[PDB]
Design a protein around this nucleic acid. Sequence first.
RNA 1: UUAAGUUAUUAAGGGCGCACGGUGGAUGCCUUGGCACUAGAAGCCGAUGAAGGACGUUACUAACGACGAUAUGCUUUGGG
RNA 2: ACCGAUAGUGAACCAGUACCGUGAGGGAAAGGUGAAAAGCACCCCGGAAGGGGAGUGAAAUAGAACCUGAAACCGUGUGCU
RNA 3: GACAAUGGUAGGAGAGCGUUCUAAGGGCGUUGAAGCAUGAUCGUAAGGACAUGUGGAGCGCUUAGAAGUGAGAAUGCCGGUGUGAGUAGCGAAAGACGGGUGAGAAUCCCGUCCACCGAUUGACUAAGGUUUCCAGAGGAAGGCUCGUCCGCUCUGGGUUAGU
RNA 4: CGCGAGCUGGGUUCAGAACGUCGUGAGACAGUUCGGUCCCUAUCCGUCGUGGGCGUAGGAAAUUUGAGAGGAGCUGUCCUU
RNA 5: AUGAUGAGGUUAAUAGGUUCGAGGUGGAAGCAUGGUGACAUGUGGAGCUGACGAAUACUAAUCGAUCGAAGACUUAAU
Lengths: 112, 120, 48, 43
Amino acid sequence: MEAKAVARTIRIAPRKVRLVLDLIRGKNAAEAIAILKLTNKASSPVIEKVLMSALANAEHNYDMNTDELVVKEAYANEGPTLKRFRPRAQGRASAINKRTSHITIVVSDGKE
Amino acid sequence: YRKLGRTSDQRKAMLRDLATSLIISERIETTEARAKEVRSVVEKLITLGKKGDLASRRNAAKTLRNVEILNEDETTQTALQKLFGEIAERYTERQGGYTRILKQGPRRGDGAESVIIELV
Amino acid sequence: AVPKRRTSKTRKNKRRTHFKISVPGMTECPNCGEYKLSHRVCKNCGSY
Amino acid sequence: VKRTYQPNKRKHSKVHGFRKRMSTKNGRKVLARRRRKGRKVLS
RNA sequence: UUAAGUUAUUAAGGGCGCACGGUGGAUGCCUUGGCACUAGAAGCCGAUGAAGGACGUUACUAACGACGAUAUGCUUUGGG
RNA sequence: ACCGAUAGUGAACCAGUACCGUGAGGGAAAGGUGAAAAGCACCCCGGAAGGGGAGUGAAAUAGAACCUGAAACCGUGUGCU
RNA sequence: GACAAUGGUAGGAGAGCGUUCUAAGGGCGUUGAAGCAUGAUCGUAAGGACAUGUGGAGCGCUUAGAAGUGAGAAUGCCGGUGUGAGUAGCGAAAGACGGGUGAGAAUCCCGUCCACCGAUUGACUAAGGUUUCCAGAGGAAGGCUCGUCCGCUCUGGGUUAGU
RNA sequence: CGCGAGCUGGGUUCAGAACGUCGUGAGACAGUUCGGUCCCUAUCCGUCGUGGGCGUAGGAAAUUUGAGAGGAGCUGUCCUU
RNA sequence: AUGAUGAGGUUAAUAGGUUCGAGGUGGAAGCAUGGUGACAUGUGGAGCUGACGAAUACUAAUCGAUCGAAGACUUAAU
């Protein structure tokens, strides 16, 4: 059985969040918490909050053993962007993309 | 020596205000490079305190800022009087050291290595 | 000054193969708490 | 550097604005043309 | 064993194929709104203060309609 | 044997309106939950957002950005390389 | 059944395929229409089917009409979306520490120290701006970072003249 | 007539002005004279350095062979004979 | 530049501190004496000294964690 959580429209950009999200996938659920507490990226308190949420949906909703779970899927999709402008020089604006992310981690124990 | 990202006078003023506050509170939280450099400042300033003569009283006041400690029972000693009176009595047998640096995690706004420098 | 050609999806992904990030220290705190960063004193949720 | 349009509440109301448009026939033409577009603010 | 000779296993990454997502609003269907007309009226008011407005008026009120201090309406005759 | 929302009036939407100009003047973009709001009581994570259940409904990847959701683009897996 | 022909640009001629609508006829659809997606199907071509998903109401076929009828190019127009690239930048400048606040503090508050302006970065007062002013409350968006703060948002207040 | 996305801009085809000359003139000369804004964050190739990956049929540590490639390579004067 | 390279990581002299130097500056402060004074002289090559040298575990190089071989066939001599 699998347990998932998502975080939709997180204001961290998708390229910046997929760095730290590559560090934790495939790894067991206990040590993935320890990686997300020690990397000093901006995304590390956000994926950790989502990994807490999917380990909680495992214990509560599906009654899994949260001690032995492994992070199967850990991906971040693109969300809707906020298109901002920026005045540079000589009356000439340039677009700034405030990108958002849908962060999704799923967790399981590998059994059916 | 390290330049700490500042001018010759901005570094000098930063480094003796950071050495005074490590006499007031005896353990302060700074960054790692600013604690590597105030380490040699305050240890050279406890060396002047273990002497205790008038000639090195004048030399410890080259460095120390004019900060007044509110001690217990509402008594007030300066940071110059607290250097030759309390720290100088603690380390009168020890031949060095006088500080330690305990590393901590990065800050939130930076990846600045936080550090507690203590007075041992 | 300007790129004469666009970079492809293949050439872009070959460039950023060293655009990675490392796993940190991760040593246990033997007194109490969770994993601390190596050679660091803990602040929260640990006894280092 | 000093730009154009240094504002003035008296001159703006006196070279534009209603009692000036109404004083000449060609300024009642600009009022009739803005009533015909449905323009919310005249003058 | 020593020679001599041959052929792998590697995928940091990439390619193709497949699968599953996300973004995005094409396409399909829909219509309050328009478009072109036909027939029948009618066309232009105002110093008795017009057209236009501005401020107001609901228990709570921003806007838009509605109506002006008798203000989110009044009277009366008929429908209902 | 007119238009179907980049069309058809600029305007199907609190349009000559946001907005632009000192001024005349210029001038947009923006329709679709379901039959019915029955619009998710409660539980869990979280500061909150968000989620995971439960529940409504014929359908909830119909959850209010809400009919279908195409490509560009972004991903995660892989079989052969 | 023989025989002959069949490279081709401007250009001429011929025969077609699809598209939307109309007419008549004949039909198909919640036992799931159109779309959409996939497939190893058929036709000489433009094309046509079928199957299976998705989809939740329309649409084929035959014959004949009508045309806003077919796009890859116009430094086309309008939308999205990349590339450059995690690159340039982050708008003159000195802060440091302690305490506090909180989900969270290099930035918020308080304190001390230091530094800067000081014929002014100090006071008034016009123009001009309109409520930004003041209290609580909040942290989506705005602030070139952060944010517990704000000229931001929410709620409630605030301007009194015979001279 | 190597080299300005390496540099200067004195020379010259810019707008000003003046002389000579020519033209009725506005102007002109290719005659002078004074003055006259030099944009670019390097994508690819190429170059100068520097890492990572893998291979080199066990894995390591250390010393080396040199297939090759590159650098160097100039010359005066004086004294003896 | 980064990373690489090198010296070290407690059985440790790696860096800092401390102690002693080297070199540098040129006679500290305080006190005494003299001068009405400004100042001189003595105390005293004095004090001070960033990167240099030596000594010293005083402080910090913690506990840990990760990666890493099992030796293919073929034929020929042996």
